[PDB]
Each structure stands twice: as structure tokens, then as C-alpha cells.
Amino acid sequence: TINKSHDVVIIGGGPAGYVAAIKAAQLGFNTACVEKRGKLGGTCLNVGCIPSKALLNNSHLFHQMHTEAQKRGIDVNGDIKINVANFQKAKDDAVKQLTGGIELLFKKNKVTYYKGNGSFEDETKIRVTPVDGLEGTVKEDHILDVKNIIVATGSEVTPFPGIEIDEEKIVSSTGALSLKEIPKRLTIIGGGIIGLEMGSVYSRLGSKVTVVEFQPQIGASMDGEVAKATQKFLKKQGLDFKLSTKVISAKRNDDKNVVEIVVEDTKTNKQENLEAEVLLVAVGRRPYIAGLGAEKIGLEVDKRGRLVIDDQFNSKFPHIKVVGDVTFGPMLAHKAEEEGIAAVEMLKTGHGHVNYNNIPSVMYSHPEVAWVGKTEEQLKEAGIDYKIGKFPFAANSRAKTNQDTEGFVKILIDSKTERILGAHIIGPNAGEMIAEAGLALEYGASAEDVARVCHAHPTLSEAFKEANMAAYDKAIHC
Amino acid sequence: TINKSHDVVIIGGGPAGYVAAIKAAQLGFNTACVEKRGKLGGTCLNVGCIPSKALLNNSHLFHQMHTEAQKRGIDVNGDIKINVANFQKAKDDAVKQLTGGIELLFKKNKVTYYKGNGSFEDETKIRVTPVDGLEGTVKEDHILDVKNIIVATGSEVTPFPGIEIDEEKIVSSTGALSLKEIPKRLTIIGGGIIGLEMGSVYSRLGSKVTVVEFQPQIGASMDGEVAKATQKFLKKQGLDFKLSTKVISAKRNDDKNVVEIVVEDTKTNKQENLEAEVLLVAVGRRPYIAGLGAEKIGLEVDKRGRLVIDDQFNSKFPHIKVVGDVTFGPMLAHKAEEEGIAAVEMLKTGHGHVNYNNIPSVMYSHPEVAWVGKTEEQLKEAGIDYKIGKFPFAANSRAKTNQDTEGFVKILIDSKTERILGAHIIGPNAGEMIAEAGLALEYGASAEDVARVCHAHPTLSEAFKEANMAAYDKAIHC
Ligand SMILES: Cc1cc2nc3c(=O)[nH]c(=O)nc-3n(C[C@H](O)[C@H](O)[C@H](O)COP(=O)(O)OP(=O)(O)OC[C@H]3O[C@@H](n4cnc5c(N)ncnc54)[C@@H](O)[C@@H]3O)c2cc1C
Ligand SMILES: Cc1cc2nc3c(=O)[nH]c(=O)nc-3n(C[C@H](O)[C@H](O)[C@H](O)COP(=O)(O)OP(=O)(O)OC[C@H]3O[C@@H](n4cnc5c(N)ncnc54)[C@H](O)[C@@H]3O)c2cc1C
Structure with a gap:
């Protein structure tokens, strides 16, 4: 128990978090950023945006060397196979450099990085609990009195009921980004952008990808014409699509190494049993309010799991602002960056606007x-x-x-x-x-x-x- | 001779020319476009924009496969070599599709394509003479009675005086575009945009490029910082720079296939005996009024060779517009296209301006x-x-x-x-x-x-x- 004070404390170091913290330091405030995991950038720089996009660009260069090279007048005389280990190292070093750059940006903006779990004590104080690993809190258990606090906790993967996501054979987006062995068959539950991108990188590499989705069209926020056309170019790329199909079971059949899936079509209520070496549950992402203690102070959570706010980004307390993936809006890193800025500008000027349109x-x-x-x-x-x-x-x-x-x-x-x-x-x-x-x-x-x-x-x-x-x-x- | 009448005639089929033809036709005019070569697109599609960018993109992908691939996690169990014939074919197919695409557009927009040279009879009419080995060189002469004449005759390579441009060893931009083998050395005389892109292509393929430029800065139309930094990354890519250096003499030798260049540094003048396999001569591009018959009606040409116009593109004769590379402004395809569309909409509205800034x-x-x-x-x-x-x-x-x-x-x-x-x-x-x-x-x-x-x-x-x-x-x- 050691007490310190700041103008602003940001609980969470993701796109909404680290950005809000840098903008506040630039706006004269004494800023704090409490991050639970050992690195900054949140989901986007460790489990999201940067991992998937590094995989996506390098898989397209393997794909162009296998398909386009001859036509572009470049002769590759021999085999071309992907080294999964260095494929992963190219991605890991990009993550390592970007997360290491956010810590350096904090150091230059003089934002105190508290490496521990952030939770409410009062509607004014934040208990920085120690977490296991490197640098627990800032030499164990802090309580921070703040004038303004911005909750920028993120999101987590929505689990499918009955499916045990052991990230090895039944992975989520995170398990899929670290696969050190490319599957012969990769089934994906979820037609969303995360599932489609993960389908692309592994089909380019060799996986016989299948995409099970309950909704008829994919990427479900897309324009109808664009989404139907998105099915078509991915189907030409080698992605199979089982649409209007609900998944019932999924179990590791460790005797055969195969994740024995069972799905059902909506139009015809018959069931097929599928077999895939790796299954991905990309059915969605939901808010993360756990460990923050929204129940202590009575910070309102809705039926979806999201902390509710007004257009000025604050909850029932005028000084407790909620931004990011835990709050309202599309779950996108740049939407969260815009909210991290606008919330902080509201504390210094009383003005800020994220154009949600x-x-x-x-x-x-x-x-x-x-x-x-x-x-x-x-x-x-x-x-x-x-x-x-x-x-x-x-x-x-x-x-x-x-x-x-x-x-x-x-x-x-x-x-x-x-x-x-x-x-x-x-x-x-x-x-x-x-x-x-x-x-x-x-x-x-x-x-x-x-x-x-x-x-x-x-x-x-x-x-x-x-x-x-x-x-x-x-x-x-x- | 056969005399036909049209509302607008375009003498040229380059960027300025063909879009002006398509736009005039779309604006209801009886449009005719006279193009001396076998294809539309002018310098840009045939020997300019489209071929150099095609060689620029495929060489870059060779460059990625040769240096970046293993670091991206792609191990090639073989030998990555550039096939110059398939590389050149990829370029040719791009040019072939694009040019054929404009003919399809001319048929769609009902433009009357005349394959032959256009000239001034007098200010009120044009003569299309038959050419030579042109597939469709309009039988015998045509004399078009036209209401409005747009001159989009464009440009040509500026020859360096004393250098024999044979399209084999002392090449121009067109020569270097169709080079069947990658030279051991490539000396370029012209540090502009064209010479630098051609330097990038061949430095990426195997040539030791040396660029020679008279003035102390490359690609000059650039910012000071951009030009210092462009020289730095190109030097980093393997291109040598001979700034503040003029070419005295350059002569092709076939008793050892080398163009023996002789340069001189403008500050502290002392001669150096350079050598190369091919010599790009990309000093510039000057206007092409040859075979137009401008001089016959007294069309004003300035000391720089440009066909002088006013703000509204008219020459001294109010119905004879002059657009593209042959007149004032930067020698860019998009600039030309804007001038093409503007000169045509001026015939409909009475006003039109291109923002040159x-x-x-x-x-x-x-x-x-x-x-x-x-x-x-x-x-x-x-x-x-x-x-x-x-x-x-x-x-x-x-x-x-x-x-x-x-x-x-x-x-x-x-x-x-x-x-x-x-x-x-x-x-x-x-x-x-x-x-x-x-x-x-x-x-x-x-x-x-x-x-x-x-x-x-x-x-x-x-x-x-x-x-x-x-x-x-x-x-x-x-
Ligand atoms: C290697 C290279 C790369 C380039 N890259 C780019 C680039 O990336 N982007 C860009 O914007 N620009 C680029 N340019 C420049 C571009 O080619 C020109 O800006 C553009 O083509 C100019 O169009 P234009 O319509 O004026 O005339 P042009 O395209 O030159 O064509 C005019 C046409 O007129 C015809 N003609 C001439 N005289 C007569 C006559 N008397 N009767 C009948 N027909 C006649 C034909 O000869 C000719 O094809 C490049 C040029 C080169 C050489
Ligand atoms: C595979 C994948 C790819 C994606 N690709 C993109 C993309 O290309 N573009 C895009 O815009 N979006 C993308 N997203 C979504 C993007 O990752 C999120 O929108 C973004 O991370 C939102 O930032 P955030 O600050 O709200 O939350 P997050 O980045 O999730 O970070 C919040 C942080 O809060 C920490 N935290 C949580 N609770 C506490 C607590 N009690 N105390 C202390 N710390 C706590 C968490 O550890 C976490 O690091 C992708 C997502 C995934 C899964």
C-alpha cells in the first residue's frame, strides 16, 4: 500500500489507452497508464492488428512467389516452401519493435507506466494490484488518487459454448497467430473480418480452409454487393464457405489428432461431422470489464457487457470516462485512438469529436x-x-x-x-x-x-x- | 483525297488527345482523333508511363524475392533468376491491353479514329495523310472540315548534341524500355524522374548504374530535403551519382562493346574517362510540332519550342486549342489529361481552368x-x-x-x-x-x-x- 496522485489515470494500454495517455501528457496533465500484460499496445499490437497484418503481408509474398512470379518474368528454379519459424519471427520482431516503441514514447512524454492490474477502490482512487512476471505494480501494491480517470480496458474473444479453446488445436485468433505448424485443414467458425483474414494467410500457405457461419453473407457490417463479391474472390483463393450453418460440437479427437466438428445447416436441419487439424473460434469479441471493479462503484454495464457512456464519453461519474472496445462503437483500433484523443481533449478544452459516421x-x-x-x-x-x-x-x-x-x-x-x-x-x-x-x-x-x-x-x-x-x-x- | 466534316478533331492520341476525344464525344460532339502511330495512348501507354511502371513493379518483386524473402520466412530451395524475355513480355502485354482498351472505348464513345498524320491545310481544316507500315493508314488523304481543332501532338526525347542515339547501345528512354539483356554497366545522363526510375529498374536487375547530372541536385522539380533524401536511398540501392557533371563526349565502340563516355566536373573542371555497356540519354523531352504544319498558318511557337497558348488554351486562332506536352506546363500525363478535358468542356461552357498548383x-x-x-x-x-x-x-x-x-x-x-x-x-x-x-x-x-x-x-x-x-x-x- 503506497499512495500517489495523478491528473489522469488510464487503465489499459491499448489504442485507446496509450494514445489517451500520450495526448494527456502533451496537454500538460500528469498522466498514468496502468497495464496488466507485460507489453503495451494492448490487443492490437500483441494479439491483433500488427500480428495478423505481418502474417498477411508475408503470406501474400509467398503466394506471389508461387503464383505470380513466372508471369512477372521471374524464374524461381526449385522449391519454395515457408519456414514457419522465421515466418513467426518476422511477425514477432515487428510486435517487439512497436510495443518497445510505445514504452519509449511514454518515457519521452513522461507517462508513468504502472505494470499491474488496475481496479477501482473509490470513485477517485485506483488500486494498482501486482500481477505475476516482470515489474509487478511499481514495487508492490499501489493506490492512486486521481482527478480524472479514463477506462480503456479492451476486449476478449467471445467463446463458443461447449467448445474448449485450448490454443494448440482449438485456437482463437491469438492461437492462430502463433501456430508453429501449418494445418492440412483449418476450419474457422465466424465469417467476420478476423476469420476471413486468418483464412487467407493459412490458405496461401497450404491449409484447406473452411468457414462455417450462421449468417448467409460474410464480414457482416459490409455492403451487400461488396460482401457477396468478397465471398467470390476468397473462394477463388481456396476458401470454402459453409454458410447459414450453426456449429453444434467440436472436440479434440486426440487419437486421430483431428478436431472432430459437427455442424447443422439452417435451411435443411441435417448434420454433418467435419474434420480439421486446427479449429478457430472467431465468432466475435466481447468487452472486458473483469478485474477493473465496475461493480464496486456501480459503473453501468449493459446486456452485451459494455460499459455505457454519453456523447461526452463519461459514465455516471463525470470524471470517469470509458473509451475503446469495452464501450460503444465498432471494435476498431483507430476508432479507439480517436476516442482516446477526444476524451483527453474534453478534459483540457471541454471539446472533442469522434465522427462515428x-x-x-x-x-x-x-x-x-x-x-x-x-x-x-x-x-x-x-x-x-x-x-x-x-x-x-x-x-x-x-x-x-x-x-x-x-x-x-x-x-x-x-x-x-x-x-x-x-x-x-x-x-x-x-x-x-x-x-x-x-x-x-x-x-x-x-x-x-x-x-x-x-x-x-x-x-x-x-x-x-x-x-x-x-x-x-x-x-x-x- | 476525301473531305469529311467533324466538329472537333484531335491531332494526337496521347493522354491529352484520347481523353479529349472521349470527352468531346460524351459531350455530343462529332469527334475525330488523328494518330500517326498504330496505337492510342501516345508516349504514356506505348513508350512511357505503362511500360516503365511495369518494369518497375516486376523488378521490385524480383528484388523482394532475392533479398527480403528469407527474412519474411520464405525459404527458396533453388535459384531466383530474372528471365528478361518473360519480363519484357509482361511489359508488352500490359501495353497491348491498355492500348486495345482505348480502341474499345473509342468504339463505345463513337470517336472516329484516323490512323495517319494530321496537318494544317489552313486554320479551318486538317489533312490526314497515309503513313507507311501502318495497319489502317487511311487509304488516301482526308481533308477534315473542322469547327474546332485541339493539338495534342505531345513530345519527343531531347537528343544530347554529339551523341548518336541508336536504340541498342546508346539508348533513350524507349530503348531502355525494351532492352533484351541486362547490361553490366548502365550510365544514365539525366538525373530526372525518367532516368532515375530506369536506374532503379536495372540496378534491381543486375546493372551497376551510374547517373550523371549537370546540376548539383537530382530530379529537380523536387524539394531540397526530398532531393537530398532521394539521392541517399538510391545510392543505398546501388546507384552512383555524378552530380555537377556534364558529358563532353560519348562514342559507341564495338571493338569491345562499350560506350566510352567522357565526363567533366563543372566545378574544378577535369576530364574522366567513363565506360558503360549501354548509355541512357534522358536529358529531357521537348515538344513535337514536326509534320503538324503549324508554321504554315503561323501558329506561335516560343524559343523553348512550345506551342504558345493563352489561359483558355487557344492559340492565336481562337478555335485551335493546344494541350498536352507540346504546350506550357509540366510534362505529365495527368496534367495532359486535365488539359484535354478542360479544352473540351470549354467548348460546351465557355470556361474552364486547371489548377496548376x-x-x-x-x-x-x-x-x-x-x-x-x-x-x-x-x-x-x-x-x-x-x-x-x-x-x-x-x-x-x-x-x-x-x-x-x-x-x-x-x-x-x-x-x-x-x-x-x-x-x-x-x-x-x-x-x-x-x-x-x-x-x-x-x-x-x-x-x-x-x-x-x-x-x-x-x-x-x-x-x-x-x-x-x-x-x-x-x-x-x-
Ligand atoms: C519513360 C517515361 C516514363 C514516363 N512516366 C510517366 C509517369 O509515370 N506519369 C506521367 O504522368 N507521365 C509520364 N511520362 C510522360 C508522359 O509520357 C507524357 O506526359 C504524356 O504521354 C503526354 O501526353 P500527350 O497527350 O501530350 O502526348 P504524347 O503522349 O506524347 O502523345 C502525342 C501523340 O501525338 C502523335 N502525333 C505527334 N505529332 C503528330 C502529327 N503531326 N500528326 C498526328 N499525330 C501526331 C503521336 O506521335 C503521339 O503518340 C513518362 C515519359 C517517359 C518517356
Ligand atoms: C486478430 C485481430 C486483428 C485485428 N485487426 C485490426 C485491424 O487491422 N484494425 C483495427 O482497427 N482493429 C483491429 N482489431 C481490433 C483491435 O485490436 C481493437 O479494436 C483495439 O485493440 C482496441 O483498443 P483498446 O485500447 O480498446 O483495447 P485493447 O487494445 O484491447 O487494450 C486494452 C488493454 O487493457 C488491458 N486491461 C484490461 N483490463 C485491465 C485492468 N483491469 N487493469 C489493467 N489493464 C487492463 C488489457 O490487458 C489490454 O492490453 C483486431 C483484433 C484482432 C483480435
């Missing part, structure tokens, strides 16, 4: 799928009259020149104001291109305004320019 | 260089007080994750209004990323307006956001 969702498969704004379904649901204007990458100059033409840029605009309402891009660099769609939405620009922007030749950004040209008038290469 | 310039090397707006030196001369914002790709999440951390983003904003005056990006995807800065400059957006938009995680576009953020205030990740 301009939050990009990007699946980093190849082609990358990315989208901002409203989908077709949402505009027809709202009764908004809209003009569609897509442009295939097969028509784009750099896409053909780079022999990477899968996808299209789709611009949905309002028919009478002609302003961009949505932008849904299946394509190479789609996560990069949606940034252009993001900035155009923030300014409330029309399809015509970006069409009048001079885009360089040859670039993939011209597909955007001309998708917009096709929306209000006519495109040149279409 | 918002035209990017992309070097498609790796890392890519790309800049739009005012340079630092341009701002010191104009007496503009400006703030600098810089964010390296070493601190960017997706760049570090992809092991491609070379470069930075540099937003130049005004000190008083804080709007983005210029943006200079060295890095992976910089050519794609400069389009976001393009929207910014168009809308008069400030460094804060980009820093406030929610950029997806993990992406390279976040480095743009963080550099804008650092320009007016402070970056979160550095």
Missing part, C-alpha cells in the same frame, strides 16, 4: 476490402435516394500494369446534393484508398469535387476519381 | 517519391512564413509491420492560415498517398483538417495524418 472498416486480405459511410442497404433502409458509381480495377491503368486487377471502387452519392454518402472499395491498397474517401466525407464533398482533383497517372487512386466521375456524370476509362 | 509529380521507385504544391524553397522566395510537419515511415505502424520503413511525409503549412501549401512524401505508396494531399489543397484544408480525420489502422495513410498533426501541433507517435 466516418469510421473506416478495413479487411486486409488481397484484394483489400475497405469502407466508409453508408452501405446500399442502409440508404434504402433510410429511404435516401442515391446514385451508384463504381469503377472496376480492370479498367485502372496501374492495376493492369501491376497485374492486380481484382475489385472495384463504388461511390454511393445523394441524388440531389451529389455528396459522397459511402465508399466501398474491394481492391489492392483499399485500406489506403479509403483514407481519400474519408477526407472527402469529412468535408462533405461531392462526387464532382474529387473528380476535379488532379490524380496522378498511373495510380490506383484514379479508380476513385473515375468511380466518382461515374457517379454524377460519366467516367473516361469506363 | 495542384498537380502531383510521382517517381515510381521504391520507396516512391511524390509531391504536390509549394516546395520549401518556393516558400522562402515568395516570402511566405511556413511551418513544417514531418513524420517518418519508421514510426508508422503498417510500414514497420511490412519491413518497409524508408521515407517520411512532409506537410508544409502557412504559419498564419495553417493551410497546406505543399506536401512532400517519400515512402511506400507515396504516389497513392499524395492524392489525399490533392483533396486537401483543393479544399484549402489545414493541417488540423487532415489530422482530425479518422485514418484506418494499421495503414501508411496514418503517416500522412501524423505529419499534418505534427505541422500545426504535435504528433502522437513521434
Whole structure:
């Protein structure tokens, strides 16, 4: 029991956490960041974003060397097999450098990193419990009196009832990122972005991937047209899709080494028994309020497990702000970064805004799928009259020149104001291109305004320019 | 001779030419496009943009397979060698599809393609003479009675005086595009964008490149910092630099197949006897008015060889527009296309302007260089007080994750209004990323307006956001 005081304490060091802590230190405050696990960055830099994307880029280079190389005029005279150990080391060292860089950024901003479990004592004090391993609390058991405290605890994997996730043979997203042996068959329960990306990296490597999902279409936040097309390019890449299918059982049959799965189709209530070497339960992610002690002070949790807030990011206590994956919004690292900034700006200025309508969702498969704004379904649901204007990458100059033409840029605009309402891009660099769609939405620009922007030749950004040209008038290469 | 009448005729089928033809046709005009060579696309699709970028991308993938592959966890049990014939074929197919795509578009938009040379009879009409080995060289002469004439004759390589450009040993950009074997040495005379991209291709394939440039800075249209840093990463890639050096003489020798270059350093003048297998002569590109018959009607040409126009693109004759590389402005395909569309919509509306302050310039090397707006030196001369914002790709999440951390983003904003005056990006995807800065400059957006938009995680576009953020205030990740 050792007592210290700070202006702000951030309980959690993820995208919402470490970002809120750096911005507060830059805003004059005496900041604290309490992180439970031995590294910072949270789920995104250790179990999320950075691990999966390192795996995804390197698997695509193995895939291009196996498929595209001959056609690109490069002869690989012999075998090309993946060294799973160094494949993992390329990913681990990226995680190691980024998490080690957040600790250095804290050190430069003079944010006191408390390496222990953060819990409430009062609605003013935070008990920093020691956790096992390297640096427990800051020489055992702290209590911190704070003026403002921002709860930036994250998320955890939603478990499937009855399935024991032993991350070895029945892995979750985390188990899948560390597999030191590539499966002959990898079954995935969940058609979401996390399941689709994990399906991609291992199918490129050799796994006969199958994706079981209760919903008909995949990536369920996607535009209908984009999602149906996302099934099609992944099915050409080698992913099988068992849709409208609920999983019943899943058990390690250790005698045969095979995770004996049993599923049932929704339209026809018959059941199949499947067999996969590794099973992945990517059914979702839920909030993590455990160990924080929301029950002591009475911080409201809803039916989903999320700490509720108002538009000013605070809960029933005006000084206790909840941000990230534990609170409302799409469970995305940059959404959490925007909330970590906006919450902290509210403490120094009384102002801050996260535009929830301009939050990009990007699946980093190849082609990358990315989208901002409203989908077709949402505009027809709202009764908004809209003009569609897509442009295939097969028509784009750099896409053909780079022999990477899968996808299209789709611009949905309002028919009478002609302003961009949505932008849904299946394509190479789609996560990069949606940034252009993001900035155009923030300014409330029309399809015509970006069409009048001079885009360089040859670039993939011209597909955007001309998708917009096709929306209000006519495109040149279409 | 046969005399047919059209509303608009375009003398040229390059970027400016064919989009002007497609747009005029889309605007209802009876459009005709006269192209002397067998294909549309001009210099860009045939011997420019599309072929060099195709060689730039495939050589980069060879370069990734040869150096980065094992570190990405991909072990090749064999030998990675570049097949120059399949490499050249990949380039040719890209060019072939693209050019054929414009013919499909000309049939779709009902443009009348005349394969033959266009000339001025008088100011009111054009003559299409038959060419030579041209597949479809319009039987015998045509005399088109035209209401409006757009001159998109473009450009040609500027020959270095005293050097015999044979497309075998003393090549120009077109020569180096179709080189059947990788030379042991490649001396380039011209440190611009074209010569540097061609240096990157062959340094990546096996050639010991040496670039020679008269002035003390390479690729000069660049910012001072960008040009010092572009020279540094290219030197790092294996390209030697002979700055402040002029070529005195260069003669092909076949008693030992070597172009014996003789250079001289402009400061402390002393001769050096250089040697190479091939010699790229990429000193520049000058306007091409040959065979047009401009002089016949007295069309004003300046001392630099450009066909002079006014603000509205008209020559001294008010119905004869001149667009593209043959007239004023930077010799860029997208600049040309904008001039093509503008000259055509001026016939419909009576007004049209191209924002010359918002035209990017992309070097498609790796890392890519790309800049739009005012340079630092341009701002010191104009007496503009400006703030600098810089964010390296070493601190960017997706760049570090992809092991491609070379470069930075540099937003130049005004000190008083804080709007983005210029943006200079060295890095992976910089050519794609400069389009976001393009929207910014168009809308008069400030460094804060980009820093406030929610950029997806993990992406390279976040480095743009963080550099804008650092320009007016402070970056979160550095
Ligand atoms: C190696 C290389 C790489 C390049 N890379 C890029 C790049 O990445 N991005 C970029 O923006 N730019 C690039 N450029 C420059 C680009 O090629 C030019 O900016 C663009 O092609 C200019 O278009 P244009 O319409 O004016 O004319 P051009 O494309 O030059 O073509 C005009 C056409 O006019 C015809 N013609 C000429 N005279 C007559 C006549 N009297 N009668 C009938 N027909 C005639 C043909 O000869 C010719 O093809 C590159 C150039 C080179 C050489
Ligand atoms: C495989 C995968 C890939 C993903 N890819 C992307 C992507 O590409 N782009 C994207 O935007 N999003 C992605 N996400 C989602 C992203 O990881 C989350 O949106 C992001 O981590 C949210 O940040 P956060 O700060 O809210 O929470 P988190 O990063 O989860 O971090 C919160 C931290 O709180 C700590 N903590 C929890 N309780 C306590 C307590 N009581 N005391 C102290 N510390 C505590 C946890 O240990 C944790 O490290 C991915 C997720 C997964 C699983």
C-alpha cells in the first residue's frame, strides 16, 4: 500500500489507452497508464492488428512467389516452401519493435507506466494490484488518487459454448497467430473480418480452409454487393464457405489428432461431422470489464457487457470516462485512438469529436476490402435516394500494369446534393484508398469535387476519381 | 483525297488527345482523333508511363524475392533468376491491353479514329495523310472540315548534341524500355524522374548504374530535403551519382562493346574517362510540332519550342486549342489529361481552368517519391512564413509491420492560415498517398483538417495524418 496522485489515470494500454495517455501528457496533465500484460499496445499490437497484418503481408509474398512470379518474368528454379519459424519471427520482431516503441514514447512524454492490474477502490482512487512476471505494480501494491480517470480496458474473444479453446488445436485468433505448424485443414467458425483474414494467410500457405457461419453473407457490417463479391474472390483463393450453418460440437479427437466438428445447416436441419487439424473460434469479441471493479462503484454495464457512456464519453461519474472496445462503437483500433484523443481533449478544452459516421472498416486480405459511410442497404433502409458509381480495377491503368486487377471502387452519392454518402472499395491498397474517401466525407464533398482533383497517372487512386466521375456524370476509362 | 466534316478533331492520341476525344464525344460532339502511330495512348501507354511502371513493379518483386524473402520466412530451395524475355513480355502485354482498351472505348464513345498524320491545310481544316507500315493508314488523304481543332501532338526525347542515339547501345528512354539483356554497366545522363526510375529498374536487375547530372541536385522539380533524401536511398540501392557533371563526349565502340563516355566536373573542371555497356540519354523531352504544319498558318511557337497558348488554351486562332506536352506546363500525363478535358468542356461552357498548383509529380521507385504544391524553397522566395510537419515511415505502424520503413511525409503549412501549401512524401505508396494531399489543397484544408480525420489502422495513410498533426501541433507517435 503506497499512495500517489495523478491528473489522469488510464487503465489499459491499448489504442485507446496509450494514445489517451500520450495526448494527456502533451496537454500538460500528469498522466498514468496502468497495464496488466507485460507489453503495451494492448490487443492490437500483441494479439491483433500488427500480428495478423505481418502474417498477411508475408503470406501474400509467398503466394506471389508461387503464383505470380513466372508471369512477372521471374524464374524461381526449385522449391519454395515457408519456414514457419522465421515466418513467426518476422511477425514477432515487428510486435517487439512497436510495443518497445510505445514504452519509449511514454518515457519521452513522461507517462508513468504502472505494470499491474488496475481496479477501482473509490470513485477517485485506483488500486494498482501486482500481477505475476516482470515489474509487478511499481514495487508492490499501489493506490492512486486521481482527478480524472479514463477506462480503456479492451476486449476478449467471445467463446463458443461447449467448445474448449485450448490454443494448440482449438485456437482463437491469438492461437492462430502463433501456430508453429501449418494445418492440412483449418476450419474457422465466424465469417467476420478476423476469420476471413486468418483464412487467407493459412490458405496461401497450404491449409484447406473452411468457414462455417450462421449468417448467409460474410464480414457482416459490409455492403451487400461488396460482401457477396468478397465471398467470390476468397473462394477463388481456396476458401470454402459453409454458410447459414450453426456449429453444434467440436472436440479434440486426440487419437486421430483431428478436431472432430459437427455442424447443422439452417435451411435443411441435417448434420454433418467435419474434420480439421486446427479449429478457430472467431465468432466475435466481447468487452472486458473483469478485474477493473465496475461493480464496486456501480459503473453501468449493459446486456452485451459494455460499459455505457454519453456523447461526452463519461459514465455516471463525470470524471470517469470509458473509451475503446469495452464501450460503444465498432471494435476498431483507430476508432479507439480517436476516442482516446477526444476524451483527453474534453478534459483540457471541454471539446472533442469522434465522427462515428466516418469510421473506416478495413479487411486486409488481397484484394483489400475497405469502407466508409453508408452501405446500399442502409440508404434504402433510410429511404435516401442515391446514385451508384463504381469503377472496376480492370479498367485502372496501374492495376493492369501491376497485374492486380481484382475489385472495384463504388461511390454511393445523394441524388440531389451529389455528396459522397459511402465508399466501398474491394481492391489492392483499399485500406489506403479509403483514407481519400474519408477526407472527402469529412468535408462533405461531392462526387464532382474529387473528380476535379488532379490524380496522378498511373495510380490506383484514379479508380476513385473515375468511380466518382461515374457517379454524377460519366467516367473516361469506363 | 476525301473531305469529311467533324466538329472537333484531335491531332494526337496521347493522354491529352484520347481523353479529349472521349470527352468531346460524351459531350455530343462529332469527334475525330488523328494518330500517326498504330496505337492510342501516345508516349504514356506505348513508350512511357505503362511500360516503365511495369518494369518497375516486376523488378521490385524480383528484388523482394532475392533479398527480403528469407527474412519474411520464405525459404527458396533453388535459384531466383530474372528471365528478361518473360519480363519484357509482361511489359508488352500490359501495353497491348491498355492500348486495345482505348480502341474499345473509342468504339463505345463513337470517336472516329484516323490512323495517319494530321496537318494544317489552313486554320479551318486538317489533312490526314497515309503513313507507311501502318495497319489502317487511311487509304488516301482526308481533308477534315473542322469547327474546332485541339493539338495534342505531345513530345519527343531531347537528343544530347554529339551523341548518336541508336536504340541498342546508346539508348533513350524507349530503348531502355525494351532492352533484351541486362547490361553490366548502365550510365544514365539525366538525373530526372525518367532516368532515375530506369536506374532503379536495372540496378534491381543486375546493372551497376551510374547517373550523371549537370546540376548539383537530382530530379529537380523536387524539394531540397526530398532531393537530398532521394539521392541517399538510391545510392543505398546501388546507384552512383555524378552530380555537377556534364558529358563532353560519348562514342559507341564495338571493338569491345562499350560506350566510352567522357565526363567533366563543372566545378574544378577535369576530364574522366567513363565506360558503360549501354548509355541512357534522358536529358529531357521537348515538344513535337514536326509534320503538324503549324508554321504554315503561323501558329506561335516560343524559343523553348512550345506551342504558345493563352489561359483558355487557344492559340492565336481562337478555335485551335493546344494541350498536352507540346504546350506550357509540366510534362505529365495527368496534367495532359486535365488539359484535354478542360479544352473540351470549354467548348460546351465557355470556361474552364486547371489548377496548376495542384498537380502531383510521382517517381515510381521504391520507396516512391511524390509531391504536390509549394516546395520549401518556393516558400522562402515568395516570402511566405511556413511551418513544417514531418513524420517518418519508421514510426508508422503498417510500414514497420511490412519491413518497409524508408521515407517520411512532409506537410508544409502557412504559419498564419495553417493551410497546406505543399506536401512532400517519400515512402511506400507515396504516389497513392499524395492524392489525399490533392483533396486537401483543393479544399484549402489545414493541417488540423487532415489530422482530425479518422485514418484506418494499421495503414501508411496514418503517416500522412501524423505529419499534418505534427505541422500545426504535435504528433502522437513521434
Ligand atoms: C519513360 C517515361 C516514363 C514516363 N512516366 C510517366 C509517369 O509515370 N506519369 C506521367 O504522368 N507521365 C509520364 N511520362 C510522360 C508522359 O509520357 C507524357 O506526359 C504524356 O504521354 C503526354 O501526353 P500527350 O497527350 O501530350 O502526348 P504524347 O503522349 O506524347 O502523345 C502525342 C501523340 O501525338 C502523335 N502525333 C505527334 N505529332 C503528330 C502529327 N503531326 N500528326 C498526328 N499525330 C501526331 C503521336 O506521335 C503521339 O503518340 C513518362 C515519359 C517517359 C518517356
Ligand atoms: C486478430 C485481430 C486483428 C485485428 N485487426 C485490426 C485491424 O487491422 N484494425 C483495427 O482497427 N482493429 C483491429 N482489431 C481490433 C483491435 O485490436 C481493437 O479494436 C483495439 O485493440 C482496441 O483498443 P483498446 O485500447 O480498446 O483495447 P485493447 O487494445 O484491447 O487494450 C486494452 C488493454 O487493457 C488491458 N486491461 C484490461 N483490463 C485491465 C485492468 N483491469 N487493469 C489493467 N489493464 C487492463 C488489457 O490487458 C489490454 O492490453 C483486431 C483484433 C484482432 C483480435
